[PDB]
Amino acid sequence: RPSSWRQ
Amino acid sequence: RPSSWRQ
Amino acid sequence: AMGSMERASLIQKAKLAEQAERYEDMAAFMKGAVEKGEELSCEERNLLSVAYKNVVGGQRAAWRVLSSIEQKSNGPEVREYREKVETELQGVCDTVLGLLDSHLIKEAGDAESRVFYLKMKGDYYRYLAEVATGDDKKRIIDSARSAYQEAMDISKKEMPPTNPIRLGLALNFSVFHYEIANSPEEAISLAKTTFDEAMADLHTLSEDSYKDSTLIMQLLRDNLTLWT
Amino acid sequence: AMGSMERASLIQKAKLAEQAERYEDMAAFMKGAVEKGEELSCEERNLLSVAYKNVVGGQRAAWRVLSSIEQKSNGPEVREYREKVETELQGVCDTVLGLLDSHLIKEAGDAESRVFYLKMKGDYYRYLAEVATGDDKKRIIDSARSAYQEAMDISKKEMPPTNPIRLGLALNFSVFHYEIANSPEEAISLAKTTFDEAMADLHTLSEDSYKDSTLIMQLLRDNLTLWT
Numbered sequence: 001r002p003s004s005w006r007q
Numbered sequence: 008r009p010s011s012w013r014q
Numbered sequence: 015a016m017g018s019m020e021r022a023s024l025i026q027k028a029k030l031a032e033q034a035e036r037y038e039d040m041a042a043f044m045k046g047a048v049e050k051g052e053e054l055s056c057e058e059r060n061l062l063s064v065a066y067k068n069v070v071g072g073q074r075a076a077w078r079v080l081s082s083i084e085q086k087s088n089g090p091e092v093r094e095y096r097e098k099v100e101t102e103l104q105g106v107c108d109t110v111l112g113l114l115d116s117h118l119i120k121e122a123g124d125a126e127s128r129v130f131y132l133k134m135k136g137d138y139y140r141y142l143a144e145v146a147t148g149d150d151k152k153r154i155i156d157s158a159r160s161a162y163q164e165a166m167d168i169s170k171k172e173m174p175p176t177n178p179i180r181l182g183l184a185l186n187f188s189v190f191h192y193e194i195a196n197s198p199e200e201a202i203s204l205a206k207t208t209f210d211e212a213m214a215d216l217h218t219l220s221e222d223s224y225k226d227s228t229l230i231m232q233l234l235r236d237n238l239t240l241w242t
Numbered sequence: 243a244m245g246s247m248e249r250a251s252l253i254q255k256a257k258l259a260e261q262a263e264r265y266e267d268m269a270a271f272m273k274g275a276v277e278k279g280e281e282l283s284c285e286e287r288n289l290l291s292v293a294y295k296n297v298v299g300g301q302r303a304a305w306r307v308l309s310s311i312e313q314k315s316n317g318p319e320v321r322e323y324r325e326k327v328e329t330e331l332q333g334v335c336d337t338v339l340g341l342l343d344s345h346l347i348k349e350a351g352d353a354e355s356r357v358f359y360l361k362m363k364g365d366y367y368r369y370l371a372e373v374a375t376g377d378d379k380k381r382i383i384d385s386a387r388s389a390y391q392e393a394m395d396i397s398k399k400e401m402p403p404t405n406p407i408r409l410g411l412a413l414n415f416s417v418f419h420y421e422i423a424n425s426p427e428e429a430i431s432l433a434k435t436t437f438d439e440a441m442a443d444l445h446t447l448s449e450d451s452y453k454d455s456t457l458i459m460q461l462l463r464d465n466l467t468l469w470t
Protein backbone atom coordinates (compact mmCIF):
# COMPACT_ATOMS: atom_id res chain seq x y z
CA ARG A 1 0.00 0.00 0.00
CA PRO A 2 2.70 2.62 0.83
CA SER A 3 5.26 3.82 -1.68
CA SER A 4 8.82 2.56 -1.50
CA TRP A 5 11.32 4.19 -3.83
CA ARG A 6 10.42 3.91 -7.52
CA GLN A 7 11.52 5.39 -10.84
CA ARG B 8 0.24 -1.04 -35.93
CA PRO B 9 -3.12 -2.71 -36.79
CA SER B 10 -5.21 -4.59 -34.26
CA SER B 11 -5.25 -8.37 -34.27
CA TRP B 12 -7.71 -10.05 -31.93
CA ARG B 13 -7.25 -9.14 -28.27
CA GLN B 14 -9.13 -9.51 -24.99
CA ALA C 15 7.85 -31.18 -16.47
CA MET C 16 4.12 -31.26 -15.66
CA GLY C 17 3.70 -35.00 -16.18
CA SER C 18 3.22 -35.80 -12.50
CA MET C 19 0.52 -33.16 -11.89
CA GLU C 20 -3.18 -33.95 -12.30
CA ARG C 21 -4.87 -32.49 -15.38
CA ALA C 22 -7.45 -30.69 -13.23
CA SER C 23 -4.72 -29.24 -10.99
CA LEU C 24 -2.83 -27.89 -14.03
CA ILE C 25 -6.05 -26.22 -15.21
CA GLN C 26 -6.70 -24.77 -11.76
CA LYS C 27 -3.12 -23.48 -11.59
CA ALA C 28 -3.36 -22.00 -15.09
CA LYS C 29 -6.32 -19.91 -13.89
CA LEU C 30 -4.36 -18.85 -10.81
CA ALA C 31 -1.39 -17.84 -12.97
CA GLU C 32 -3.66 -15.73 -15.18
CA GLN C 33 -4.93 -13.89 -12.08
CA ALA C 34 -1.31 -13.38 -10.99
CA GLU C 35 -0.38 -12.24 -14.54
CA ARG C 36 2.21 -15.04 -14.64
CA TYR C 37 1.77 -15.93 -18.27
CA GLU C 38 4.92 -18.05 -18.66
CA ASP C 39 3.68 -20.24 -15.80
CA MET C 40 0.17 -20.22 -17.30
CA ALA C 41 1.50 -21.47 -20.63
CA ALA C 42 3.58 -24.22 -19.02
CA PHE C 43 0.53 -25.39 -17.05
CA MET C 44 -1.66 -25.43 -20.17
CA LYS C 45 1.09 -27.20 -22.15
CA GLY C 46 1.07 -29.86 -19.44
CA ALA C 47 -2.73 -30.07 -19.64
CA VAL C 48 -2.61 -30.57 -23.41
CA GLU C 49 0.05 -33.29 -23.05
CA LYS C 50 -2.39 -35.30 -20.93
CA GLY C 51 -3.79 -36.28 -24.33
CA GLU C 52 -7.44 -35.40 -23.75
CA GLU C 53 -9.31 -32.90 -25.90
CA LEU C 54 -9.74 -29.40 -24.49
CA SER C 55 -13.01 -27.78 -23.51
CA CYS C 56 -14.03 -24.33 -24.79
CA GLU C 57 -12.76 -22.72 -21.58
CA GLU C 58 -9.53 -24.73 -21.64
CA ARG C 59 -8.84 -23.74 -25.26
CA ASN C 60 -9.28 -20.10 -24.26
CA LEU C 61 -6.80 -20.59 -21.40
CA LEU C 62 -4.25 -22.09 -23.79
CA SER C 63 -4.67 -19.22 -26.26
CA VAL C 64 -4.48 -16.42 -23.66
CA ALA C 65 -1.34 -17.86 -22.08
CA TYR C 66 0.77 -18.24 -25.20
CA LYS C 67 -0.64 -15.03 -26.71
CA ASN C 68 0.65 -13.06 -23.74
CA VAL C 69 4.03 -14.85 -23.69
CA VAL C 70 4.69 -14.40 -27.39
CA GLY C 71 3.17 -10.91 -27.24
CA GLY C 72 5.90 -9.75 -24.87
CA GLN C 73 8.53 -11.41 -27.05
CA ARG C 74 7.19 -9.70 -30.18
CA ALA C 75 7.17 -6.30 -28.48
CA ALA C 76 10.75 -6.83 -27.33
CA TRP C 77 11.86 -8.04 -30.77
CA ARG C 78 10.38 -4.94 -32.42
CA VAL C 79 12.19 -2.63 -29.98
CA LEU C 80 15.52 -4.36 -30.68
CA SER C 81 14.95 -4.64 -34.44
CA SER C 82 14.33 -0.89 -34.57
CA ILE C 83 17.51 -0.17 -32.62
CA GLU C 84 19.42 -2.55 -34.91
CA GLN C 85 18.14 -0.77 -38.02
CA LYS C 86 19.13 2.65 -36.66
CA SER C 87 22.64 1.27 -36.13
CA ASN C 88 22.92 -0.19 -39.66
CA GLY C 89 29.57 -3.77 -32.17
CA PRO C 90 27.69 -7.05 -32.56
CA GLU C 91 25.71 -6.72 -29.31
CA VAL C 92 22.46 -5.34 -30.73
CA ARG C 93 22.29 -8.03 -33.42
CA GLU C 94 23.28 -10.73 -30.91
CA TYR C 95 20.58 -9.77 -28.41
CA ARG C 96 17.92 -9.36 -31.13
CA GLU C 97 18.87 -12.86 -32.31
CA LYS C 98 18.58 -14.24 -28.77
CA VAL C 99 15.09 -12.79 -28.29
CA GLU C 100 14.16 -13.93 -31.81
CA THR C 101 15.32 -17.49 -31.12
CA GLU C 102 13.28 -17.61 -27.90
CA LEU C 103 10.21 -16.33 -29.74
CA GLN C 104 10.67 -18.96 -32.45
CA GLY C 105 10.94 -21.61 -29.75
CA VAL C 106 7.62 -20.59 -28.21
CA CYS C 107 5.94 -20.59 -31.63
CA ASP C 108 7.37 -24.03 -32.43
CA THR C 109 6.08 -25.28 -29.08
CA VAL C 110 2.53 -24.05 -29.80
CA LEU C 111 2.58 -25.44 -33.33
CA GLY C 112 3.81 -28.75 -31.93
CA LEU C 113 0.88 -28.91 -29.53
CA LEU C 114 -1.55 -28.18 -32.36
CA ASP C 115 0.09 -30.85 -34.49
CA SER C 116 0.40 -33.43 -31.65
CA HIS C 117 -2.46 -33.81 -31.51
CA LEU C 118 -5.02 -31.04 -30.95
CA ILE C 119 -6.03 -30.44 -34.57
CA LYS C 120 -6.38 -34.04 -35.70
CA GLU C 121 -8.74 -34.84 -32.82
CA ALA C 122 -10.81 -31.63 -33.24
CA GLY C 123 -14.03 -32.65 -34.99
CA ASP C 124 -16.43 -29.89 -34.02
CA ALA C 125 -16.35 -26.60 -35.91
CA GLU C 126 -15.71 -24.47 -32.82
CA SER C 127 -12.62 -26.45 -31.78
CA ARG C 128 -11.24 -27.08 -35.28
CA VAL C 129 -11.57 -23.41 -36.33
CA PHE C 130 -10.10 -22.30 -33.01
CA TYR C 131 -6.96 -24.42 -33.48
CA LEU C 132 -6.53 -23.57 -37.17
CA LYS C 133 -6.73 -19.88 -36.27
CA MET C 134 -4.00 -20.47 -33.66
CA LYS C 135 -1.92 -22.32 -36.26
CA GLY C 136 -2.22 -19.36 -38.62
CA ASP C 137 -1.37 -16.90 -35.86
CA TYR C 138 1.81 -18.66 -34.76
CA TYR C 139 3.04 -19.12 -38.31
CA ARG C 140 2.27 -15.41 -38.74
CA TYR C 141 4.49 -14.64 -35.74
CA LEU C 142 7.26 -16.78 -37.23
CA ALA C 143 6.78 -14.89 -40.50
CA GLU C 144 7.17 -11.51 -38.76
CA VAL C 145 10.82 -12.38 -38.02
CA ALA C 146 11.57 -14.59 -41.06
CA THR C 147 14.34 -13.51 -43.46
CA GLY C 148 15.93 -16.66 -44.93
CA ASP C 149 14.92 -19.22 -47.55
CA ASP C 150 12.00 -20.38 -45.34
CA LYS C 151 10.00 -17.13 -45.21
CA LYS C 152 7.86 -17.93 -48.25
CA ARG C 153 6.98 -21.39 -46.96
CA ILE C 154 6.22 -19.99 -43.49
CA ILE C 155 3.89 -17.40 -45.03
CA ASP C 156 2.13 -20.08 -47.07
CA SER C 157 1.81 -22.21 -43.94
CA ALA C 158 0.05 -19.33 -42.19
CA ARG C 159 -2.15 -18.64 -45.23
CA SER C 160 -3.10 -22.31 -45.59
CA ALA C 161 -4.14 -22.66 -41.94
CA TYR C 162 -6.15 -19.42 -42.01
CA GLN C 163 -7.81 -20.47 -45.29
CA GLU C 164 -8.93 -23.85 -43.94
CA ALA C 165 -10.32 -22.15 -40.83
CA MET C 166 -12.14 -19.57 -42.97
CA ASP C 167 -13.69 -22.30 -45.16
CA ILE C 168 -14.98 -24.17 -42.11
CA SER C 169 -16.24 -21.05 -40.30
CA LYS C 170 -18.16 -19.79 -43.33
CA LYS C 171 -19.84 -23.17 -43.76
CA GLU C 172 -20.53 -23.96 -40.09
CA MET C 173 -20.83 -20.72 -38.11
CA PRO C 174 -23.01 -17.61 -38.13
CA PRO C 175 -21.30 -14.38 -39.27
CA THR C 176 -21.39 -13.00 -35.69
CA ASN C 177 -19.65 -15.98 -34.06
CA PRO C 178 -16.74 -14.51 -32.03
CA ILE C 179 -14.19 -17.07 -33.20
CA ARG C 180 -15.23 -16.51 -36.83
CA LEU C 181 -14.88 -12.74 -36.35
CA GLY C 182 -11.52 -13.01 -34.60
CA LEU C 183 -10.25 -15.36 -37.30
CA ALA C 184 -11.30 -12.97 -40.07
CA LEU C 185 -9.74 -10.07 -38.15
CA ASN C 186 -6.40 -11.89 -37.88
CA PHE C 187 -6.42 -13.19 -41.45
CA SER C 188 -6.98 -9.61 -42.59
CA VAL C 189 -3.97 -8.46 -40.53
CA PHE C 190 -2.01 -11.30 -42.16
CA HIS C 191 -3.03 -9.96 -45.57
CA TYR C 192 -2.08 -6.39 -44.67
CA GLU C 193 1.11 -6.92 -42.66
CA ILE C 194 2.59 -10.20 -43.94
CA ALA C 195 1.30 -10.90 -47.46
CA ASN C 196 1.56 -7.31 -48.78
CA SER C 197 -2.09 -7.54 -49.88
CA PRO C 198 -3.71 -4.48 -48.28
CA GLU C 199 -6.66 -4.53 -50.68
CA GLU C 200 -7.43 -8.12 -49.70
CA ALA C 201 -7.10 -7.10 -46.03
CA ILE C 202 -9.52 -4.19 -46.47
CA SER C 203 -12.06 -6.25 -48.48
CA LEU C 204 -12.01 -9.06 -45.94
CA ALA C 205 -12.45 -6.66 -43.00
CA LYS C 206 -15.34 -4.85 -44.68
CA THR C 207 -17.30 -7.91 -45.82
CA THR C 208 -16.79 -9.53 -42.40
CA PHE C 209 -18.07 -6.41 -40.62
CA ASP C 210 -21.04 -5.95 -42.96
CA GLU C 211 -22.18 -9.58 -42.79
CA ALA C 212 -21.90 -9.57 -38.99
CA MET C 213 -23.86 -6.31 -38.80
CA ALA C 214 -26.71 -7.99 -40.71
CA ASP C 215 -26.78 -10.95 -38.26
CA LEU C 216 -26.79 -8.96 -35.00
CA HIS C 217 -30.59 -8.94 -34.79
CA THR C 218 -30.51 -12.68 -33.98
CA LEU C 219 -28.39 -12.29 -30.85
CA SER C 220 -29.04 -11.98 -27.14
CA GLU C 221 -27.81 -8.89 -25.33
CA ASP C 222 -24.73 -10.81 -24.13
CA SER C 223 -23.84 -12.27 -27.53
CA TYR C 224 -24.48 -8.84 -29.08
CA LYS C 225 -21.83 -7.30 -26.82
CA ASP C 226 -19.38 -10.13 -27.63
CA SER C 227 -19.73 -9.68 -31.39
CA THR C 228 -19.80 -5.89 -31.54
CA LEU C 229 -16.61 -5.74 -29.47
CA ILE C 230 -14.71 -7.63 -32.16
CA MET C 231 -16.52 -5.76 -34.94
CA GLN C 232 -15.03 -2.57 -33.48
CA LEU C 233 -11.54 -4.01 -33.97
CA LEU C 234 -12.42 -4.59 -37.62
CA ARG C 235 -13.64 -0.99 -37.78
CA ASP C 236 -10.48 0.33 -36.09
CA ASN C 237 -8.34 -1.37 -38.74
CA LEU C 238 -10.48 -0.11 -41.62
CA THR C 239 -10.12 3.42 -40.24
CA LEU C 240 -6.35 3.00 -40.00
CA TRP C 241 -6.14 1.47 -43.50
CA THR C 242 -8.42 3.83 -45.45
CA ALA D 243 26.28 -18.35 -17.84
CA MET D 244 27.66 -14.92 -18.76
CA GLY D 245 31.30 -15.78 -18.08
CA SER D 246 32.33 -15.77 -21.74
CA MET D 247 30.80 -12.36 -22.55
CA GLU D 248 32.81 -9.14 -22.22
CA ARG D 249 31.92 -6.91 -19.27
CA ALA D 250 31.18 -3.98 -21.57
CA SER D 251 28.95 -6.14 -23.79
CA LEU D 252 26.95 -7.31 -20.76
CA ILE D 253 26.45 -3.67 -19.75
CA GLN D 254 25.42 -2.71 -23.28
CA LYS D 255 22.98 -5.64 -23.40
CA ALA D 256 21.56 -4.75 -19.97
CA LYS D 257 20.66 -1.31 -21.36
CA LEU D 258 19.09 -2.92 -24.42
CA ALA D 259 17.05 -5.27 -22.22
CA GLU D 260 15.78 -2.32 -20.18
CA GLN D 261 14.59 -0.64 -23.40
CA ALA D 262 12.90 -3.90 -24.39
CA GLU D 263 11.40 -4.23 -20.87
CA ARG D 264 13.13 -7.60 -20.57
CA TYR D 265 14.00 -7.34 -16.91
CA GLU D 266 14.89 -11.00 -16.33
CA ASP D 267 17.47 -10.71 -19.12
CA MET D 268 18.61 -7.35 -17.75
CA ALA D 269 19.22 -8.88 -14.32
CA ALA D 270 21.13 -11.84 -15.74
CA PHE D 271 23.35 -9.47 -17.75
CA MET D 272 24.04 -7.29 -14.70
CA LYS D 273 24.69 -10.38 -12.55
CA GLY D 274 27.28 -11.41 -15.14
CA ALA D 275 28.78 -7.91 -15.05
CA VAL D 276 29.09 -8.02 -11.26
CA GLU D 277 30.73 -11.46 -11.42
CA LYS D 278 33.52 -9.96 -13.52
CA GLY D 279 34.83 -8.82 -10.12
CA GLU D 280 35.27 -5.13 -10.85
CA GLU D 281 33.50 -2.42 -8.88
CA LEU D 282 30.41 -0.88 -10.46
CA SER D 283 30.05 2.70 -11.61
CA CYS D 284 27.12 4.90 -10.53
CA GLU D 285 25.27 4.12 -13.76
CA GLU D 286 26.05 0.40 -13.50
CA ARG D 287 24.76 0.25 -9.92
CA ASN D 288 21.53 1.87 -11.09
CA LEU D 289 21.23 -0.75 -13.85
CA LEU D 290 21.68 -3.55 -11.32
CA SER D 291 19.05 -2.07 -8.99
CA VAL D 292 16.45 -1.40 -11.71
CA ALA D 293 16.76 -4.91 -13.12
CA TYR D 294 16.30 -6.88 -9.92
CA LYS D 295 13.73 -4.39 -8.60
CA ASN D 296 11.53 -5.06 -11.62
CA VAL D 297 12.04 -8.84 -11.48
CA VAL D 298 11.27 -9.14 -7.79
CA GLY D 299 8.53 -6.53 -8.14
CA GLY D 300 6.57 -8.80 -10.47
CA GLN D 301 7.16 -11.73 -8.14
CA ARG D 302 5.92 -9.75 -5.13
CA ALA D 303 2.79 -8.64 -6.98
CA ALA D 304 2.08 -12.23 -8.00
CA TRP D 305 2.73 -13.53 -4.47
CA ARG D 306 0.28 -11.01 -3.01
CA VAL D 307 -2.44 -12.02 -5.49
CA LEU D 308 -1.98 -15.71 -4.62
CA SER D 309 -1.64 -15.11 -0.87
CA SER D 310 -4.95 -13.23 -0.92
CA ILE D 311 -6.66 -16.06 -2.80
CA GLU D 312 -5.15 -18.56 -0.35
CA GLN D 313 -6.49 -16.61 2.64
CA LYS D 314 -9.99 -16.43 1.16
CA SER D 315 -9.88 -20.21 0.80
CA ASN D 316 -8.73 -20.82 4.40
CA GLY D 317 -7.42 -28.63 -2.71
CA PRO D 318 -3.70 -27.97 -2.23
CA GLU D 319 -3.23 -26.15 -5.55
CA VAL D 320 -3.45 -22.56 -4.30
CA ARG D 321 -0.95 -23.20 -1.50
CA GLU D 322 1.31 -25.17 -3.85
CA TYR D 323 1.42 -22.42 -6.48
CA ARG D 324 1.87 -19.66 -3.87
CA GLU D 325 4.79 -21.70 -2.50
CA LYS D 326 6.30 -22.06 -5.97
CA VAL D 327 6.16 -18.31 -6.63
CA GLU D 328 7.43 -17.67 -3.10
CA THR D 329 10.39 -20.01 -3.59
CA GLU D 330 11.32 -18.28 -6.86
CA LEU D 331 11.11 -14.88 -5.18
CA GLN D 332 13.33 -16.08 -2.34
CA GLY D 333 15.81 -17.37 -4.91
CA VAL D 334 16.05 -13.98 -6.60
CA CYS D 335 16.52 -12.25 -3.23
CA ASP D 336 19.23 -14.74 -2.23
CA THR D 337 20.95 -14.10 -5.57
CA VAL D 338 21.00 -10.32 -5.02
CA LEU D 339 22.18 -10.68 -1.42
CA GLY D 340 24.90 -13.04 -2.64
CA LEU D 341 26.13 -10.45 -5.11
CA LEU D 342 26.20 -7.78 -2.40
CA ASP D 343 28.08 -10.15 -0.10
CA SER D 344 30.47 -11.45 -2.81
CA HIS D 345 31.82 -8.90 -3.02
CA LEU D 346 30.12 -5.57 -3.79
CA ILE D 347 29.79 -4.26 -0.23
CA LYS D 348 33.26 -5.12 1.04
CA GLU D 349 34.91 -3.30 -1.87
CA ALA D 350 32.60 -0.24 -1.66
CA GLY D 351 34.61 2.50 0.04
CA ASP D 352 32.87 5.66 -1.13
CA ALA D 353 29.71 6.80 0.61
CA GLU D 354 27.58 6.79 -2.56
CA SER D 355 28.40 3.16 -3.40
CA ARG D 356 28.41 1.81 0.16
CA VAL D 357 25.05 3.43 1.04
CA PHE D 358 23.60 2.28 -2.29
CA TYR D 359 24.50 -1.37 -1.62
CA LEU D 360 23.44 -1.32 2.04
CA LYS D 361 20.07 0.09 0.97
CA MET D 362 19.77 -2.79 -1.52
CA LYS D 363 20.70 -5.25 1.22
CA GLY D 364 17.96 -3.85 3.44
CA ASP D 365 15.44 -3.93 0.59
CA TYR D 366 16.03 -7.56 -0.33
CA TYR D 367 15.93 -8.72 3.28
CA ARG D 368 12.70 -6.70 3.52
CA TYR D 369 11.30 -8.66 0.55
CA LEU D 370 12.32 -11.93 2.22
CA ALA D 371 10.60 -10.68 5.39
CA GLU D 372 7.35 -9.96 3.52
CA VAL D 373 6.94 -13.73 2.93
CA ALA D 374 8.65 -15.05 6.09
CA THR D 375 6.61 -17.17 8.53
CA GLY D 376 8.97 -19.68 10.18
CA ASP D 377 11.64 -19.48 12.88
CA ASP D 378 13.80 -17.24 10.63
CA LYS D 379 11.45 -14.26 10.30
CA LYS D 380 12.84 -12.39 13.30
CA ARG D 381 16.43 -12.81 12.14
CA ILE D 382 15.49 -11.77 8.59
CA ILE D 383 13.81 -8.62 9.94
CA ASP D 384 16.87 -7.80 12.04
CA SER D 385 19.08 -8.38 9.00
CA ALA D 386 17.04 -5.81 7.07
CA ARG D 387 17.05 -3.37 10.00
CA SER D 388 20.81 -3.72 10.50
CA ALA D 389 21.61 -3.03 6.84
CA TYR D 390 19.26 -0.03 6.70
CA GLN D 391 20.71 1.31 9.97
CA GLU D 392 24.31 1.14 8.74
CA ALA D 393 23.29 2.89 5.51
CA MET D 394 21.43 5.58 7.48
CA ASP D 395 24.46 6.20 9.73
CA ILE D 396 26.76 6.62 6.73
CA SER D 397 24.31 8.80 4.75
CA LYS D 398 23.70 11.16 7.65
CA LYS D 399 27.44 11.61 8.18
CA GLU D 400 28.53 11.81 4.53
CA MET D 401 25.66 13.12 2.40
CA PRO D 402 23.49 16.23 2.22
CA PRO D 403 19.84 15.78 3.26
CA THR D 404 18.68 16.18 -0.38
CA ASN D 405 20.93 13.45 -1.82
CA PRO D 406 18.61 11.14 -3.83
CA ILE D 407 20.10 7.92 -2.45
CA ARG D 408 19.82 9.25 1.11
CA LEU D 409 16.17 10.19 0.47
CA GLY D 410 15.32 6.87 -1.16
CA LEU D 411 17.01 4.99 1.68
CA ALA D 412 15.04 6.92 4.30
CA LEU D 413 11.85 6.37 2.31
CA ASN D 414 12.40 2.60 2.23
CA PHE D 415 13.52 2.33 5.85
CA SER D 416 10.32 4.13 6.81
CA VAL D 417 8.27 1.61 4.79
CA PHE D 418 10.21 -1.13 6.61
CA HIS D 419 9.19 0.44 9.92
CA TYR D 420 5.55 0.73 8.90
CA GLU D 421 5.01 -2.53 7.01
CA ILE D 422 7.54 -4.99 8.49
CA ALA D 423 8.53 -3.86 11.99
CA ASN D 424 5.02 -2.81 13.15
CA SER D 425 6.47 0.58 14.14
CA PRO D 426 4.20 3.09 12.36
CA GLU D 427 5.19 5.94 14.67
CA GLU D 428 8.86 5.38 13.83
CA ALA D 429 7.90 5.26 10.13
CA ILE D 430 5.99 8.55 10.36
CA SER D 431 8.73 10.32 12.37
CA LEU D 432 11.43 9.19 9.97
CA ALA D 433 9.43 10.30 6.91
CA LYS D 434 8.67 13.71 8.42
CA THR D 435 12.18 14.54 9.64
CA THR D 436 13.63 13.36 6.30
CA PHE D 437 11.20 15.55 4.35
CA ASP D 438 11.72 18.60 6.57
CA GLU D 439 15.52 18.41 6.53
CA ALA D 440 15.54 17.99 2.74
CA MET D 441 13.16 20.94 2.35
CA ALA D 442 15.66 23.12 4.23
CA ASP D 443 18.54 22.06 1.92
CA LEU D 444 16.77 22.60 -1.42
CA HIS D 445 18.07 26.16 -1.75
CA THR D 446 21.58 24.78 -2.39
CA LEU D 447 20.58 22.77 -5.47
CA SER D 448 20.63 23.32 -9.20
CA GLU D 449 17.36 23.15 -11.11
CA ASP D 450 18.14 19.55 -12.13
CA SER D 451 19.10 18.36 -8.64
CA TYR D 452 16.05 20.21 -7.26
CA LYS D 453 13.76 18.15 -9.51
CA ASP D 454 15.55 14.92 -8.50
CA SER D 455 15.14 15.57 -4.77
CA THR D 456 11.59 16.94 -4.79
CA LEU D 457 10.42 13.91 -6.77
CA ILE D 458 11.46 11.60 -3.93
CA MET D 459 10.24 14.06 -1.31
CA GLN D 460 6.77 13.70 -2.86
CA LEU D 461 6.91 9.94 -2.20
CA LEU D 462 7.65 10.74 1.45
CA ARG D 463 4.68 13.13 1.41
CA ASP D 464 2.41 10.53 -0.23
CA ASN D 465 3.18 8.06 2.55
CA LEU D 466 2.65 10.63 5.31
CA THR D 467 -0.74 11.45 3.78
CA LEU D 468 -1.65 7.75 3.68
CA TRP D 469 -0.39 7.19 7.24
CA THR D 470 -1.88 10.22 9.02
Ligand SMILES: *Cc1ccc(-n2ccnc2-c2ccccc2)c2ccccc12
Pocket residue numbers: 012056059060063064133178179181182183226
Ligand atom coordinates in the same frame (compact mmCIF):
# COMPACT_ATOMS: atom_id res chain seq x y z
C1 LIG E 1 -9.33 -15.66 -31.38
C2 LIG E 1 -10.51 -15.36 -30.47
C3 LIG E 1 -11.62 -14.70 -30.99
C4 LIG E 1 -12.71 -14.42 -30.17
C5 LIG E 1 -12.70 -14.80 -28.83
N1 LIG E 1 -13.86 -14.47 -28.01
C6 LIG E 1 -14.15 -13.24 -27.66
C7 LIG E 1 -15.29 -13.27 -26.91
N2 LIG E 1 -15.68 -14.53 -26.82
C8 LIG E 1 -14.80 -15.30 -27.50
C9 LIG E 1 -14.92 -16.82 -27.63
C10 LIG E 1 -15.67 -17.51 -26.69
C11 LIG E 1 -15.81 -18.89 -26.77
C12 LIG E 1 -15.20 -19.58 -27.80
C13 LIG E 1 -14.44 -18.89 -28.74
C14 LIG E 1 -14.31 -17.52 -28.66
C15 LIG E 1 -11.56 -15.48 -28.28
C16 LIG E 1 -11.54 -15.87 -26.91
C17 LIG E 1 -10.42 -16.53 -26.39
C18 LIG E 1 -9.33 -16.81 -27.22
C19 LIG E 1 -9.34 -16.43 -28.56
C20 LIG E 1 -10.49 -15.75 -29.09
Ligand SMILES: *Cc1ccc(-n2ccnc2-c2ccccc2)c2ccccc12
Pocket residue numbers: 005284287288291292361406407409410411454
Ligand atom coordinates in the same frame (compact mmCIF):
# COMPACT_ATOMS: atom_id res chain seq x y z
C1 LIG F 1 17.16 3.76 -4.19
C2 LIG F 1 17.32 4.93 -5.15
C3 LIG F 1 17.06 6.22 -4.69
C4 LIG F 1 17.20 7.31 -5.56
C5 LIG F 1 17.59 7.10 -6.88
N1 LIG F 1 17.71 8.27 -7.75
C6 LIG F 1 16.67 8.95 -8.16
C7 LIG F 1 17.11 9.98 -8.95
N2 LIG F 1 18.43 9.90 -8.99
C8 LIG F 1 18.83 8.84 -8.25
C9 LIG F 1 20.29 8.44 -8.06
C10 LIG F 1 21.23 8.87 -8.99
C11 LIG F 1 22.57 8.53 -8.84
C12 LIG F 1 22.97 7.76 -7.77
C13 LIG F 1 22.04 7.33 -6.84
C14 LIG F 1 20.71 7.67 -6.98
C15 LIG F 1 17.86 5.78 -7.36
C16 LIG F 1 18.26 5.56 -8.71
C17 LIG F 1 18.51 4.26 -9.16
C18 LIG F 1 18.37 3.17 -8.29
C19 LIG F 1 17.98 3.38 -6.97
C20 LIG F 1 17.72 4.71 -6.50
Ligand SMILES: [Ca+2]
Pocket residue numbers: 020021
Ligand atom coordinates in the same frame (compact mmCIF):
# COMPACT_ATOMS: atom_id res chain seq x y z
CA1 LIG G 1 -5.25 -38.20 -13.51
Ligand SMILES: [Ca+2]
Pocket residue numbers: 053121122123124
Ligand atom coordinates in the same frame (compact mmCIF):
# COMPACT_ATOMS: atom_id res chain seq x y z
CA1 LIG H 1 -12.84 -35.15 -31.22
Ligand SMILES: [Ca+2]
Pocket residue numbers: 248249
Ligand atom coordinates in the same frame (compact mmCIF):
# COMPACT_ATOMS: atom_id res chain seq x y z
CA1 LIG I 1 37.46 -8.60 -20.89
Ligand SMILES: [Ca+2]
Pocket residue numbers: 281349350351352
Ligand atom coordinates in the same frame (compact mmCIF):
# COMPACT_ATOMS: atom_id res chain seq x y z
CA1 LIG J 1 36.66 0.36 -3.58
Ligand SMILES: [Cl-]
Pocket residue numbers: 094095098255
Ligand atom coordinates in the same frame (compact mmCIF):
# COMPACT_ATOMS: atom_id res chain seq x y z
CL1 LIG K 1 22.85 -12.00 -26.23
Ligand SMILES: [Cl-]
Pocket residue numbers: 027322323326
Ligand atom coordinates in the same frame (compact mmCIF):
# COMPACT_ATOMS: atom_id res chain seq x y z
CL1 LIG L 1 2.81 -25.41 -8.48
Ligand code: NA
Pocket residue numbers: 079082083086
Ligand atom coordinates in the same frame (compact mmCIF):
# COMPACT_ATOMS: atom_id res chain seq x y z
NA1 NA M 1 14.82 2.63 -32.11
Ligand code: NA
Pocket residue numbers: 307310311314
Ligand atom coordinates in the same frame (compact mmCIF):
# COMPACT_ATOMS: atom_id res chain seq x y z
NA1 NA N 1 -8.34 -12.59 -3.52
